Design a protein around this ligand. Structure first.
Ligand SMILES: *[C@@H]1O[C@H](CO)[C@@H](O)[C@H](O)[C@H]1NC(C)=O
Ligand SMILES: *[C@@H]1O[C@H](CO)[C@@H](O)[C@H](O)[C@H]1NC(C)=O
Ligand SMILES: *[C@@H]1O[C@H](CO)[C@@H](O)[C@H](O)[C@H]1NC(C)=O
Ligand SMILES: *[C@@H]1O[C@H](CO)[C@@H](O)[C@H](O)[C@H]1NC(C)=O
Ligand SMILES: *[C@@H]1O[C@H](CO)[C@@H](O)[C@H](O)[C@H]1NC(C)=O
Ligand SMILES: *[C@@H]1O[C@H](CO)[C@@H](O)[C@H](O)[C@H]1NC(C)=O
Ligand SMILES: *[C@@H]1O[C@H](CO)[C@@H](O)[C@H](O)[C@H]1NC(C)=O
Ligand SMILES: *[C@@H]1O[C@H](CO)[C@@H](O)[C@H](O)[C@H]1NC(C)=O
Ligand SMILES: *[C@@H]1O[C@H](CO)[C@@H](O)[C@H](O)[C@H]1NC(C)=O
Ligand SMILES: *[C@@H]1O[C@H](CO)[C@@H](O)[C@H](O)[C@H]1NC(C)=O
Ligand SMILES: *[C@@H]1O[C@H](CO)[C@@H](O)[C@H](O)[C@H]1NC(C)=O
Lengths: 96, 240, 246, 49, 49, 49
C-alpha cells in the first residue's frame, strides 16, 4: 500500500469534467452542430430534429407531422436507459 | 479502535504489512501508520525567464515547514489568488501555477473557459451573414529514428572471453537485433504509407493563374538548391 | 470551380464563392501569411516532433550511461577485470557486467518497441488525413481542422508531416424570427433545403450557413399536409410564378 | 542500489510520461469547447424531456 | 528480484496506458463526430441511422 | 521456483488475457449480424454473377 506507491490526483477534477459535459449538452441542445465550427448559433430544437432528419434522407415533414410520438419515444428510451443503468451494472464493467 | 482476540499480538493488512500492534507491557491496541513520506516537486518558470521557484510537497500537508494546502499537497513559495486563469503549469486537482505579476509565482484554480449563455427561444434562429477563411496547422509525427545496436559490441567491447560468456546465454543478441530491425523496417513503411499516395508525379504549370489565390509559400521554388518551399524551409529549421 | 464544388460540399450555394472571390482570395492569402509569421516567430510550434527526437535521444543517452555502472563487479571497464584477475576469478565480475548490460539492452528494446507502436498509430492517422483531408473532402466534423473543411495541404517536416487545413468559419450572426412552416390556403409549406426567416415584416427562405434571402415561392418550398399538425405554422402568402404569367 | 546506475530514474521517467498522457487523454476527450454554455431556465425543447 | 518486479510493473503499465490511449482517441473522435456533428458513418455512432 | 513470488501466475494472466482478446477480435469483426441470412436459390441478380 504505502511502500512508496503514491497515487497522484488527476488534473481535471470530476466537477470540471462534469462542467465540460454540461457545456457540451447545452451547446448541442441550444445550437446543435454549429458550436463546434465557430460561434454558437441558436436554433429551436424542433428545427434541429428536422435538419437531422434531412441528414438521413427522411423528408422533414415526417418530424413535424409526428413530433409528439418522437418526443414520447425519446423520453421512454431515456427512461429505459435509466433503468438499465440503475438495476444493472453489466456494461459498466468495461470501466471496472 | 480495533479489538484483538485475547491472545493476538499484532495485526496485518491485505498487503501483508503490519498495520496494527498490541502493546506487550499494557493491554492496549496501538496502530502503526508509516511516517509522512512523499515526493518533492519543483514548480518553475524558465531559467531563461526567472529564478523564482515554488516547491510542491506531494501527498502530505504542511506539517514540516505563502504556504498553502492543495489536494496535491502542501505548496510553499506560491501565492494563492482568488482569480482564475488559463492553466499554465499543472499541479493537480484543478490547480495550476503560473508566473504572473514584481513578478512572482501564483497558484490558482483552473479556468475551464469563458462563461457563455446561448439565447434560446421557440422562434429565434441565428443565421450568419458573413464568413472567414481560417487556415489551421496540424503537426503529426510519421517516422522515428532508425537505430540498430550491435549487442556484442555493446556488452563486450573488443573482448573474446566476454564474447564466449555471452555465447553461453543462447540467442538474446539475435532476438534484440531482430526486434530493432523490425522497428527500422516499420519506420520506412510509415513514410511510404503517408507520403507515397500517388504514383504519377504531378507538377504545376509555369503560368500560375489560380483565380486570385497565391500559392507561393507552399509550392517549391526551384531557385533554391533543395527544391522545397518556404514553409517547409521554415519547418526544417525549428526541429533540431 | 474547385471551390465552387467545395462550397457546395459544405452546404453553401456556389454563387457565394464567385460573388466574393477576391475577398476569399485575400482571406486565404492573409491566413497563409499569418501561418508563416506564427511559425517564424515562435520556435516551439513543432513540439509534437521534438518530443519524439528528445525522447529517443534520452533513451540512447540512458543506454550509453548504463555502461559506467559496476553492477556488483570490481570495475565497469572490462579490460581492468581482464588484466587484474585470474581466468576463473574474472568471469564472475564479467558475468555481473554481462547480466547488467543485457538487462539494459532488453529494457531499451522493449521501450523502443512500445514507442514504435505509438509512432505507427500516429502514422496511420496521418495517412488517413492525407487520404481524406487532402486527397478528398471530409464531412467528418473537426477531423480536418475546426470548422467546415474546404481543402487541405501537405507540407513535410523532420520525421513527420504537417497539414494546412483550409476551413470555413461563419462569422457575423444575426437574430431572426423563424417558423417551421407556412400556412397559405390550408396547406403546409416546408422548405426544400433551407430555413424560413423573417426580418419582421415579410417571410423569406435562406440556406442555413449564409444569409441570402429568397422570396418564398412554390419552388423554394414543398407542400405536405395541412395547417393543423405542425406546431408553429404561421400565415403568409407563398408567391406563385405562374400568376403573373397566365 | 546506487551501484546499478540509473534504473530508478528511468522507471520514474516512464511513470511520469504515463501520468502526463492520462491528463492529455482526459483533456483531448472532454475539453473540446472553449466557451462554457448554459441552458435557459425555460426548457421549451419541443417536448423532449 | 525487487528491481525485476518493479520493472515488470512498469512494462505492463506502459502497455495498458497505450491501450487506454487508443480508446481515448476513440472517445475524442466520438465527441468530435457523434456529439458535435451528425455522423454518416455506419454503426460508428450507434446501431441505426 | 516457488521462491520467486507471483511471476508464474502473472505470466498466465497475461497470456489468458491475450487469448480472450483474440476471441473478442474475431467476434467483433465477423459477428456484426444476429440473423443468418440466405440467398434464394433463384439467382436473378440483375445480370451480376
Ligand atoms: C534568455 O535570456 C537572455 C538573457 O538572460 C536573453 O538575451 C534571451 O532573449 C532569452 N531567451 C529568449 C528566447 O528570449
Ligand atoms: C494535515 O491534514 C489533516 C487532515 O486534513 C489535518 O488534521 C492537519 O491539521 C493537517 N496538518 C497541518 C499542519 O495543517
Ligand atoms: C480569497 O477570498 C477568500 C474568501 O473571501 C478569503 O478568505 C481569502 O483571504 C482571499 N484570498 C486572498 C489572497 O486575499
Ligand atoms: C465580411 O467581412 C469582411 C471583413 O472580413 C468585410 O470586408 C466585408 O464587407 C463583410 N461582408 C459583409 C457582407 O458584411
Ligand atoms: C505572392 O506573395 C509573395 C509573398 O512574399 C510575394 O513575394 C509575391 O510577389 C506574390 N505573388 C503574387 C503573384 O501575388
Ligand atoms: C441575439 O439575441 C441575444 C439575446 O437577446 C443577444 O444576446 C445577442 O447579442 C443577439 N445577437 C444579435 C446578432 O442580434
Ligand atoms: C423586410 O424586407 C422587406 C423586403 O421585401 C422590406 O420590404 C421590409 O421593409 C423589411 N422589413 C424590415 C423590418 O427590415
Ligand atoms: C412559443 O412560446 C409559447 C410560450 O411562451 C408556447 O406556448 C409556444 O408553444 C411556443 N411556440 C412553439 C412553436 O412551440
Ligand atoms: C392563420 O390563418 C388561418 C386561416 O388561413 C386562421 O384560421 C388562423 O387562425 C391564423 N393563425 C392565427 C395565429 O391567427
Ligand atoms: C421529465 O422527467 C422527470 C423524471 O422522469 C419528471 O420529474 C419531469 O416532470 C418531466 N418533465 C416533463 C415536462 O414531463
Ligand atoms: C458465373 O460464373 C461461373 C464461372 O465463370 C459460371 O460457371 C456460371 O455459369 C456463371 N453464372 C451464370 C448465371 O452464368
Amino acid at each position: 500500500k504505502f511502500n512508496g506507491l503514491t497515487v497522484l490526483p488527476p488534473l481535471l477534477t470530476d466537477e470540471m469534467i462534469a462542467q465540460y459535459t454540461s457545456a457540451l449538452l447545452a451547446g448541442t441542445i441550444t445550437s446543435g452542430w454549429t458550436f463546434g465550427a465557430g460561434a454558437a448559433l441558436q436554433i429551436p430544437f424542433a428545427m434541429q430534429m428536422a435538419y437531422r432528419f434531412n441528414g438521413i434522407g427522411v423528408t422533414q415533414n415526417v418530424l413535424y407531422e409526428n413530433q409528439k410520438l418522437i418526443a414520447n419515444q425519446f423520453n421512454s428510451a431515456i427512461g429505459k436507459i435509466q433503468d438499465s443503468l440503475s438495476s444493472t451494472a453489466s456494461a459498466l464493467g468495461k470501466l471496472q | 479502535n480495533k479489538k484483538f482476540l485475547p491472545f493476538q499480538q499484532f495485526g496485518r493488512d491485505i498487503a501483508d504489512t503490519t498495520d496494527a500492534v498490541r502493546d506487550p507491557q499494557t493491554l492496549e491496541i496501538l496502530d502503526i501508520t508509516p511516517c509522512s513520506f512523499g515526493g518533492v516537486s519543483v514548480i518553475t518558470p524558465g531559467t531563461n525567464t526567472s529564478n523564482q521557484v515554488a516547491v510542491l510537497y506531494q501527498d502530505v500537508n504542511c506539517t514540516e515547514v505563502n504556504v498553502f494546502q492543495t489536494r496535491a499537497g502542501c505548496l510553499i513559495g506560491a501565492e494563492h489568488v482568488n482569480n482564475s486563469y488559463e492553466c499554465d503549469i499543472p499541479i493537480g486537482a484543478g490547480i495550476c501555477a503560473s508566473y504572473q505579476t514584481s513578478q512572482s509565482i501564483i497558484a490558482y484554480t483552473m479556468s475551464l473557459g469563458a462563461e457563455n449563455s446561448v439565447a434560446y427561444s421557440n422562434n429565434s434562429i441565428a443565421i450568419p451573414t458573413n464568413f472567414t477563411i481560417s487556415v489551421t496547422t496540424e503537426i503529426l509525427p510519421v517516422s522515428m529514428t532508425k537505430t540498430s545496436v550491435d549487442c556484442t559490441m555493446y556488452i563486450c567491447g573488443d573482448s573474446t572471453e566476454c564474447s564466449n560468456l555471452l555465447l553461453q546465454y543462447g540467442s538474446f543478441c539475435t532476438q534484440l537485433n531482430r526486434a530493432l530491425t523490425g522497428i527500422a523496417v516499420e519506420q520506412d513503411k510509415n513514410t511510404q504509407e503517408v507520403f507515397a499516395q500517388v504514383k504519377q508525379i504531378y507538377k504545376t504549370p509555369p503560368i500560375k493563374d489560380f483565380g486570385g489565390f497565391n500559392f507561393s509559400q507552399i509550392l517549391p521554388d526551384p531557385s533554391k538548391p533543395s527544391k522545397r518551399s518556404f514553409i517547409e524551409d521554415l519547418l526544417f529549421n525549428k526541429v533540431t | 470551380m474547385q471551390m465552387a464544388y467545395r462550397f457546395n460540399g459544405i452546404g453553401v450555394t456556389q454563387n457565394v464563392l464567385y460573388e466574393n472571390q477576391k475577398l476569399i482570395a485575400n482571406q486565404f492569402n492573409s491566413a497563409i501569411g499569418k501561418i508563416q509569421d506564427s511559425l517564424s516567430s515562435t520556435a516551439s510550434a513543432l513540439g509534437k516532433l521534438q518530443d519524439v527526437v528528445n525522447q529517443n535521444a534520452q533513451a540512447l543517452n540512458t543506454l550509453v550511461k548504463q555502461l559506467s555502472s559496476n553492477f556488483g563487479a570490481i570495475s565497469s571497464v572490462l579490460n581492468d577485470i581482464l588484466s587484474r584477475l585470474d581466468k576463473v576469478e574474472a568471469e564472475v565480475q564479467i558475468d555481473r557486467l554481462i547480466t547488467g548490460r543485457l538487462q539494459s539492452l532488453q529494457t531499451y528494446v522493449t521501450q523502443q518497441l512500445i514507442r514504435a507502436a505509438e509512432i505507427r498509430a500516429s502514422a496511420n492517422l496521418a495517412a488517413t488525413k492525407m487520404s481524406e483531408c487532402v486527397l478528398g473532402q471530409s464531412k467528418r466534423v473537426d477531423f480536418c481542422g475546426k470548422g467546415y473543411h474546404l481543402m487541405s495541404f501537405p507540407q513535410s517536416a523532420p520525421h513527420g508531416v504537417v497539414f494546412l487545413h483550409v476551413t470555413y468559419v461563419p462569422a457575423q450572426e444575426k437574430n431572426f424570427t423563424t417558423a417551421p412552416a407556412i400556412c397559405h390556403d390550408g396547406k403546409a409549406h416546408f422548405p426544400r433545403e433551407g430555413v424560413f426567416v423573417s426580418n419582421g415584416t415579410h417571410w423569406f427562405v435562406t440556406q442555413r450557413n449564409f444569409y441570402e434571402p429568397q422570396i418564398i415561392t412554390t419552388d423554394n418550398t414543398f407542400v405536405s399536409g395541412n395547417c393543423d399538425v405542425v406546431i408553429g405554422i404561421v400565415n403568409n402568402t407563398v408567391y406563385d410564378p405562374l400568376q403573373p404569367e397566365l
